[PDB]
Amino acid sequence: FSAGGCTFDDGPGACDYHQDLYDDFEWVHVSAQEPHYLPPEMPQGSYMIVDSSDHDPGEKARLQLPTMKENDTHCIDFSYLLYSQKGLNPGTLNILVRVNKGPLANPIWNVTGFTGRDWLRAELAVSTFWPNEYQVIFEAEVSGGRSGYIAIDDIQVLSYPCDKSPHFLRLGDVEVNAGQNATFQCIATGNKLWLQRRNGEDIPVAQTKNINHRRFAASFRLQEVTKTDQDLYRCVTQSERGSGVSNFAQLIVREPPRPIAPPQLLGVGPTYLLIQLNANSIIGDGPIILKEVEYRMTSGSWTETHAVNAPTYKLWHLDPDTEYEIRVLLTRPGEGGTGLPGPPLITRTKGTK
Amino acid sequence: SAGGCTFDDGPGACDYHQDLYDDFEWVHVSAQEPHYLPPEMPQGSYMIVDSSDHDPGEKARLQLPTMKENDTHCIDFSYLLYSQKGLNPGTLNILVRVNKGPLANPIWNVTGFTGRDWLRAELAVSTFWPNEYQVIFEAEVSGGRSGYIAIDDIQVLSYPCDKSPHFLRLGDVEVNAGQNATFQCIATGRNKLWLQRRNGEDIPVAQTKNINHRRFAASFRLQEVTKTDQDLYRCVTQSERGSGVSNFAQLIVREPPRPIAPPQLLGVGPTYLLIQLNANSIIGDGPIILKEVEYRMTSGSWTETHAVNAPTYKLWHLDPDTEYEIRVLLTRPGEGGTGLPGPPLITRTKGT
Numbered sequence A: 001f002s003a004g005g006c007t008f009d010d011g012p013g014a015c016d017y018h019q020d021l022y023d024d025f026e027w028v029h030v031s032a033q034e035p036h037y038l039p040p041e042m043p044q045g046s047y048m049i050v051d052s053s054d055h056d057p058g059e060k061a062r063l064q065l066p067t068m069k070e071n072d073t074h075c076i077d078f079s080y081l082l083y084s085q086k087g088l089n090p091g092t093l094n095i096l097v098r099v100n101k102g103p104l105a106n107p108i109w110n111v112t113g114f115t116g117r118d119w120l121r122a123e124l125a126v127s128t129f130w131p132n133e134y135q136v137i138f139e140a141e142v143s144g145g146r147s148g149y150i151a152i153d154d155i156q157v158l159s160y161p162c163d164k165s166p167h168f169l170r171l172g173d174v175e176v177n178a179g180q181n182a183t184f185q186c187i188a189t190g191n192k193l194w195l196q197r198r199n200g201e202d203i204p205v206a207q208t209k210n211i212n213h214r215r216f217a218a219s220f221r222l223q224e225v226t227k228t229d230q231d232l233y234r235c236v237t238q239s240e241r242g243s244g245v246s247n248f249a250q251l252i253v254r255e256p257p258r259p260i261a262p263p264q265l266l267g268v269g270p271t272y273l274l275i276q277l278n279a280n281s282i283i284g285d286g287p288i289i290l291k292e293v294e295y296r297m298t299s300g301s302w303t304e305t306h307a308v309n310a311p312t313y314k315l316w317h318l319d320p321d322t323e324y325e326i327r328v329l330l331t332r333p334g335e336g337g338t339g340l341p342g343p344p345l346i347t348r349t350k351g352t353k
Numbered sequence B: 001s002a003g004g005c006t007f008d009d010g011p012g013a014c015d016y017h018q019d020l021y022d023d024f025e026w027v028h029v030s031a032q033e034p035h036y037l038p039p040e041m042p043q044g045s046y047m048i049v050d051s052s053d054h055d056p057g058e059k060a061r062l063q064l065p066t067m068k069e070n071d072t073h074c075i076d077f078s079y080l081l082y083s084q085k086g087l088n089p090g091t092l093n094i095l096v097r098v099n100k101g102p103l104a105n106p107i108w109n110v111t112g113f114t115g116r117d118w119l120r121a122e123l124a125v126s127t128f129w130p131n132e133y134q135v136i137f138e139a140e141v142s143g144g145r146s147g148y149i150a151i152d153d154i155q156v157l158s159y160p161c162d163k164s165p166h167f168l169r170l171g172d173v174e175v176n177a178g179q180n181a182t183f184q185c186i187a188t189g190r191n192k193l194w195l196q197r198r199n200g201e202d203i204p205v206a207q208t209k210n211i212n213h214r215r216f217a218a219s220f221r222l223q224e225v226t227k228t229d230q231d232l233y234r235c236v237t238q239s240e241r242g243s244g245v246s247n248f249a250q251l252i253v254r255e256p257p258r259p260i261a262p263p264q265l266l267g268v269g270p271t272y273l274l275i276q277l278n279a280n281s282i283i284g285d286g287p288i289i290l291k292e293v294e295y296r297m298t299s300g301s302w303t304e305t306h307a308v309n310a311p312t313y314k315l316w317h318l319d320p321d322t323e324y325e326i327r328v329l330l331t332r333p334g335e336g337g338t339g340l341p342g343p344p345l346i347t348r349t350k351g352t
C-alpha cells in the first residue's frame, strides 16, 4: 500500500508525522517499552494521546501527516477514542485536510464527547490527486478541567476496499458573470452533507436527488455572485463511520466589460460623422464577443444600435448642424455578459454654409 | 459635383460609356442634325432607344461614371417612353452597381407609354467613400417593336434632394446557422419597399412602423438562415418620383463548432478514466468560448457535464467494469452557438 500511515510503535517521527512548536501543546507518544502510567482501562501498545488535565479550555494540539500526492483512488483509516475515568467530555477530535499547503479550512470529520475505552474506527476518502497534494491534520481541541484523554492509533493508507465512507466524483469548476446565480453539483457513491469554502462560510444544501441505487446528487446554490465570492469550494459529507471529501473546484466571477475612454471624431461633414471608438482599453473581462455602437440625436426620441468590428465607424444621411451622442457597448460570454454603455462622445455635424 | 450630363456634346463628353456585351447601343440625338424623329418628340439633345430596330428583350446599357462621394447627394434625370400610337415601348431600368461588383436587380423602373413630355425622377444612394457605385440606365425593348425610350438632363445634386427617401446606415448582421436573422432600415420621408439581395432573390417586407415625424422604419425577417444566404443586402424604396437605396449590409452565417474526432483513452483503472479530448480540430467556426466534457454511464440515468480548458481530463471514483460514454461539446458566441456533441468515446473501467 501507499506510504503515509503509522502504527506509532517507533513513534510519530518514524512515520514522517510532525508537530509545530507554535501550537498550544504537543500530542504525546504512548509506547510499549515505557512505564504504563495511564489508567489501566486505556489500551495497551504504542499510540498518540492528548490529556485535557494539563491544559485550559480550547487549547489545540495538532499532529500533521506527510504530504499525499497520489494518482489512484485511496482512503485513510484511523482509530480514535475519547476517555474519562468519570465519563467527562475530554474535548473534540477534529480532522482537517489541507490542500496545496494552503488554508486549512474547517474540519471535515469530528467527534465530540466520551466514547469509551475501546478503539473506534473511521475512514477518510479525499478526492485530491496529483499534481495536487494534501495533508491530513489530527486536531485535538481540549475541553479543559482534567476531563480525560483524546487518543489516536493505527493510521493506514489503503487502496481497497475503501467502502466505509462515501466517495465524491470530480467536482467541476464554475464560471459566471457577476450578479448571476452559480450552482455547484456534487455526485457521491454510497448523513450530514455540505459545501465547504476554502476560506469562508460553509454553504448549506439547496437540493438533493437519489439518482441511482449506488449514487446520489446534491446541489448548492450561490445567488447573485460577487467578485469577492471567487474562491475554491469542495463538497464534504460526514458519518460516524467516516467522511468523504471532494476536490477544491474553483468559482470564477467575471466582470462585464465597458470602455475606459469615450469615442473621438476623426472627420465630419454636413451629413456624416467619422468616429473612432477607442474601445480597445476597457474595465472588466474579455473576451469581447460583440462590440456595438449606439448613436442618438440629442433631441432624439430613439437610438440606433449597430454591431461594429472595426476601430472606426461612419454614420451618414445625418442632419446638418445637429448634435449627436455616441456610445459603445461591449459584450462577453454568458448571461449578464453585456456590459454598461461606455462614456459618450457628444459632437455635431457641420452646417449648410 | 461632376458626373451629370446634359448631352449637348454627347455621352462621351460626360464620361458616359456603354457595355460591349450589350445587345445594342443607346443613340445620341442632337439639335445639330435635322429632326428626323416624330415631331411630337421633344427637341434638343438627349439619348434615345428605338424599339423598332430591335427584337423583344434586347437590352441597351448606358453607364455613368463611378461616384465615390462623402455627404448626402442625389441624381436627377428626365425620361419618357413614347409611341405615335400609344404603344408600350418597353422598360427603362436603373441599376446601381456597388464596388464594381454584381449589378443586382433594378432599383427604379418604368414600363409603358408615358407621353411626349419629359418626366423627372430622383435617386438617393447611401453608398459612400471608401465604397463606390455606378448608375446604369438600361432599356429593355418591348417586342411590340414600336416607339422610343429616352433620357435627358442628368444632374448630380447635394441639395435639396427631397423627392426620394434617404436610408440611414444599414448595419451588418451575424447569426449562427439555423437562427432567424433580421434587417432593419430607417428612412426619411413621407410606397413600394423591399430588401434587395445582391446575387439572389428580393425579400419582401415583414413589418413597418413609425418611429418619428420625419423618419419611418421597416423590418425584414429571414427564417432559419443557412450558409447559402450569406450575401450582401440593401434596402430599396421606389415611387413614381424616384428611389432611395441603402448601403450593402452583410449577412454572416456562422457554423456552430463540433470536434471532428472522438476522445481517446490515455489511461484506465478500476475507478478512473484519463481522457484526451482531441477537440483542437473542428468543423464549425471559432472562436471557441466554452469547451465541455460530458460523461455518462451507459445505463444513462444521469449525465455529468464539466467545463474543461485543457487537452486532457481525468474522471474518478467510477464503478469498476462499467461502460462510460464520453463526448466533447464546443460553443461559439451567440444564440445557437452551442454545437452538436462530438463523436463519443465508449469505454469501460477495469475490474480488479
Ligand SMILES: *[C@@H]1O[C@H](CO)[C@@H](O[C@@H]2O[C@H](CO)[C@@H](O[C@@H]3O[C@H](CO)[C@@H](O)[C@H](O[C@H]4O[C@H](CO)[C@@H](O)[C@H](O)[C@@H]4O)[C@@H]3O)[C@H](O)[C@H]2NC(C)=O)[C@H](O)[C@H]1NC(C)=O
Residues within 6 Å of the ligand: A092, A094, A106, A107, A108, A109, A110, A112, A194, A199, A200, A201, A202
Ligand atoms: C465539526 O465540523 C463542522 C464542519 O466543519 C464544524 O461546523 C462548522 O463550524 C464553523 C465554525 O468553526 C462554521 O463557520 C462559521 O459559521 C458561522 C455561522 O454559523 C459564521 O458566522 C462564521 O463566520 C466567521 O468566518 C468568516 C470567514 O469569512 C468571517 O468573515 C466572519 O466574520 C466569522 O469570523 C464561520 O463561517 C461552519 O459554518 C460550520 N459548518 C457546518 C457545516 O456546520 C463544527 O464547528 C465542528 N465542531 C467542532 C467542535 O469543531
Ligand SMILES: *[C@@H]1O[C@H](CO)[C@@H](O[C@@H]2O[C@H](CO)[C@@H](O[C@@H]3O[C@H](CO)[C@@H](O)[C@H](O)[C@@H]3O)[C@H](O)[C@H]2NC(C)=O)[C@H](O)[C@H]1NC(C)=O
Residues within 6 Å of the ligand: B091, B093, B105, B106, B107, B108, B109, B111, B194, B200, B201, B202
Ligand atoms: C422592376 O424592378 C423590380 C425590382 O428589382 C423587379 O422585381 C424583381 O424581379 C426579379 C426578376 O427579374 C425577381 O427575382 C425573381 O424572383 C422570383 C421569385 O419571386 C424567382 O423565382 C426568380 O428566379 C427571380 O429570382 C425579384 O423577386 C423581383 N423583386 C420584386 C421586389 O418584385 C421587376 O422585375 C422589374 N421590372 C422590370 C419590367 O424589369
Ligand SMILES: *[C@@H]1O[C@H](CO[C@@H]2O[C@@H](C)[C@@H](O)[C@@H](O)[C@@H]2O)[C@@H](O[C@@H]2O[C@H](CO)[C@@H](O)[C@H](O)[C@H]2NC(C)=O)[C@H](O)[C@H]1NC(C)=O
Residues within 6 Å of the ligand: A069, A070, A071, A130
Ligand atoms: C502520478 O502521475 C504522475 C504523472 O505520470 C504519469 O502517470 C504515471 C502513473 C505513469 O503512467 C507515468 O508514465 C505518466 O507520465 C507522476 O509524475 C511523474 O513521475 C515520474 C516518476 O517519478 C517522473 O519520472 C515524471 O517526471 C513525473 N511527471 C510526469 C509528467 O510524468 C507521479 O509521480 C505519480 N505519482 C504517484 C504517487 O503515483
Ligand SMILES: *[C@@H]1O[C@H](CO)[C@@H](O[C@@H]2O[C@H](CO)[C@@H](O)[C@H](O)[C@H]2NC(C)=O)[C@H](O)[C@H]1NC(C)=O
Residues within 6 Å of the ligand: A267, B068, B069, B070, B129
Ligand atoms: C471622403 O473623405 C475622405 C476622408 O477625408 C477622403 O479621403 C482622403 O481624400 C484626400 C483627397 O481629398 C486624400 O489626399 C487622402 O489620401 C484621402 N484619405 C484620407 C484617409 O484622408 C475622400 O477623398 C473623400 N471623398 C470625397 C469625394 O469627398
Ligand SMILES: *[C@@H]1O[C@H](CO)[C@@H](O)[C@H](O)[C@H]1NC(C)=O
Residues within 6 Å of the ligand: A179, A180, A181, A223, A224
Ligand atoms: C437568482 O435566483 C433568484 C431566485 O428567486 C432570482 O430571483 C434571481 O433573479 C436570480 N438571479 C439571476 C442573475 O439569475
Ligand SMILES: *[C@@H]1O[C@H](CO)[C@@H](O)[C@H](O)[C@H]1NC(C)=O
Residues within 6 Å of the ligand: B178, B179, B180, B223, B224
Ligand atoms: C423563425 O421564424 C419562424 C416563423 O417564420 C418560427 O416558426 C421559428 O420558430 C423561428 N426560429 C427561431 C430560431 O427563432
Ligand code: NA
Residues within 6 Å of the ligand: A007, A008, A009, A045, A046, A047, A153, A154
Ligand atoms: Na499502535
Ligand code: NA
Residues within 6 Å of the ligand: B006, B007, B008, B044, B045, B046, B152, B153
Ligand atoms: Na439635354
